Structures are given as C-alpha cells and as structure tokens.
Ligand binder design. Structure first.
Ligand SMILES: [Fe+2]
Ligand SMILES: [Fe+2]
Ligand SMILES: [Fe+2]
Ligand SMILES: [Fe+2]
Lengths: 124, 123, 123, 123
C-alpha cells in the first residue's frame, strides 16, 4: 500500500490518534505527527497535512471528519528557513457522533510519502 | 468586498480568534464560528472551513498558517441529516513564531458566503 | 482497505485517469468521477474531491501532485438545490516530470465513502 | 486588504481567469498564475493554491466553486529541487451555471502573500 504504518514510539511519521473526549454525543480527537519523536519542519522537509476519517458502527461507508493543512515552513523573501513561522503538524477535530466506531488518520510528508494510523472510538 | 465582517457577539458567522498559549514563541490559536451565537450544521447549511493567516511585524507579506476543513454534515445513504456525524467548525492551529504580528482568519458558510476576523498576536 | 475499487465502466464512483499529454516531460492528467456512468451532484449527495498521486520510477516514495475540491452543490438561502451552481467532479493536473511512473487517484463521495484508481504514465 | 491586485501582463503573481467553454449547461473556467510572466516553482518558492469564487446575478451571497492545490515542488530525500516533479499552478474548474455573474479567484505564493483577480461570466 501507499500508506505506510509503523510503531509511533519508533517512527516519527506515524499520525498518532488521541481521544480527548467521547460522551454525550460530542467527541474531541487530537491527531499528531512526531508525538514521541519530533519530525523536522524546514522549507525542504515537512509534514503537509493530516486527514481524519470516522466510520460509525452500523454504517456501511466511512466519513471524512476533516482535514488540517500545515502551510508555514520558514519560507520567506530572505530565503528558506528565515521567516520564523513554522506550523506544527497537530490537529484537533471536534465533532458530534451518535455511536461508536473506527477512526483512521492519514498523513503526508513532502519527501517520505503517505502514512496512516488507526484507533477505536468508544462513545459514552 | 467578499469577506463579510461584524461583531461576533451578535453575528453567528464571524470567525472568533483566541490565543490559548504564547510562551517562548510556541503558539496555539483556536478559531471558531458560532462562539456566542450558534450556527447550524446541517447537510444543507453548514460552515465548510476556516483558514488562518499570520503576518509578523516587519514582514512585507502575510503567511497562511493552516486550513481546517469540516467535512461531515450528517449526509448518509438514508437521507440528509441521518448519519449522526457533524464536524464542529472549530480548529486549533499550533505554530512557532518569533515576533508578534497580525492574525487574520477566514471562513465560509455554504449559503451565507465569505467571512473574516482579526486579532493581534502579542508575544 | 478503506479505498474501494471497481471497473469504471460499471461503477460510477471510480476516479478515471486520462493522460491528455506527456510530451517532453510536460504532462497533463485529467481525472474524473462518473465518466461512463454519471454520478449525482445534489446538496445531499456528491463527489467532494479528487487527489492525484505520482511515483516516479527510481523514487522510493510517492508524491502528491495536487488536490481538487468540488465545493458547490446547489445550496442557497432559498434551500437545497436552488442556487444553480454545481461543480462537476473533473480535474486537470498539469505538471513536469523527468521519468515514467505510476499514477494513483483518490476520490470521496459524501455518503458512499472513499475510492481509488490507477494508471501508468509513460513519457 | 491582504489580497493583492495588479495588471497580469506586468505582475507574475496575478491569477488569470479564462472562460473556455459553455456547453450543455456546463461552463469551463481556467485559472492560472504566471500566464504572461512566469512564476518560479522551486522547493523554496512556489504558488501553493488557486481558489475560484462565483456569485450569480441576483444572489445575495458568493459560492466557492472549488480549490486546487499544487503539491509538488521538487523536494526529495536527495534534497530540494531533485525529484523532477513540479505542479504547474494551473487549474480548470468545470461547473453548472444557469445565470451570469462575477468570477473571483484567489491565490497564494509561499513568500509573496495572497493575490486576487476578477472576471465576468456571461451566459
Ligand atoms: Fe519526513
Ligand atoms: Fe450560514
Ligand atoms: Fe455516491
Ligand atoms: Fe512569489
């Protein structure tokens, strides 16, 4: 597959999924690349986006919950890595859900290809 | 001007900018629509996205920090508004900054057009 | 896998990849959903986007070439399917490339999930 | 205003709107940066996206037709400007439209800020 997987404790590229809240219909999910091991963020090398998909139990098809783009990577008129502005590849997705299901995150490095990770959403 | 503006206390569409953290230039900015007055999230009427722009003092040009799309609005094979899955129009942008500057947020409702808001980042 | 696949001559959701031109490393790829069999485009039901991926021979990783979002689906203040504006899910990706390689397209329907298709790019 | 405007013949950054065709209720609209004067596409310096807005006669609000991201700028594990893949900042938007209106296009360079262009659609 194009979507690489790995242990996130060992591999900086794996998008890590964290369920911050899941109760009373409302959910809070944080996705982060480089959680254990930081990934570089330079004009030449950076994580560009994270996309979160959720498939409720009982639903034949998955739904994209959202997508986060990280657009600043130090680039300026003075040259690469000079602007002082760097977007950290961490996104928080807030959404309503009526029952439990599966989460999948997709992420992209401009040089190291595509990555995915999976997690259970246990709704209360 | 395409980008509408108003007082977020009385207008549901205004993207509200909140600086949650700014220590040592490590910054986290939350932007949301419907902070004071809620905006609908239905298959037929919803906020689709928020985009954050930061221009540091001394910088000739602004920079886009990030963009957040909210993609679920209840649609399913069984009809509109039946999936139970609705993405809130709230995003948190985390980024490094070494100078104070001007934050500009842009947002889009599928039927009520384009919106903007502003706030100063002070380090 | 999340990314469904099928024969585009019998399944409307399959993103279809056409190499319009590839002369002297100046490439134009059309990608579309609903080429043989039309897909609907209503407020309730539509193709949201297509993303094109290219991996040059000799390259260990693939590169996203582009993404197209199809944002209008008829919604207005007069209700769903009243604006008269509906973006067709057809994109054209124009790019330079030094070598032949593999093309992968991904697309998404707001109620029928995620989809994919593949084609070879020969220079 | 953040959105810069200029004469596209003199200014490489201006997104240029071109109505190609109108057939069977579908309109084709090409947007491109660097038509008259080319813009660079390096790992360091490049146009990242184009977004097209359409507001039909009589509509109180504008609608986003679509957005195109140009994701490849030469970066590889071998360094900047080594992969051979570079996405031209050129997009084609195909959509249905029953009425005339105003076309607005927005675009972004990673170091030269945000840009806008306007054209009329006549149907
Ligand atoms: Fe990487
Ligand atoms: Fe609205
Ligand atoms: Fe569908
Ligand atoms: Fe530029």
């Amino acid at each position: 597959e194009l979507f690489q997987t790995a242990d996130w404790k060992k591999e900086k590229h794996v998008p890590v999924i964290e369920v911050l809240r899941a109760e009373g219909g409302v959910v809070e999910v944080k996705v982060s690349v480089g959680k254990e091991i930081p990934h570089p963020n330079t004009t030449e090398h950076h994580i560009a986006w994270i996309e979160l998909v959720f498939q409720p139990e009982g639903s034949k098809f998955p739904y994209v919950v959202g997508r986060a783009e990280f657009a600043a990577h130090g680039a300026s008129v003075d040259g690469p890595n000079t602007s002082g502005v760097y977007t950290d590849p961490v996104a928080v997705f807030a959404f309503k859900a009526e029952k439990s299901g599966k989460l999948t995150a997709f992420s992209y490095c401009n040089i190291h290809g595509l990555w995915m990770g999976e997690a259970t959403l246990s709704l209360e």
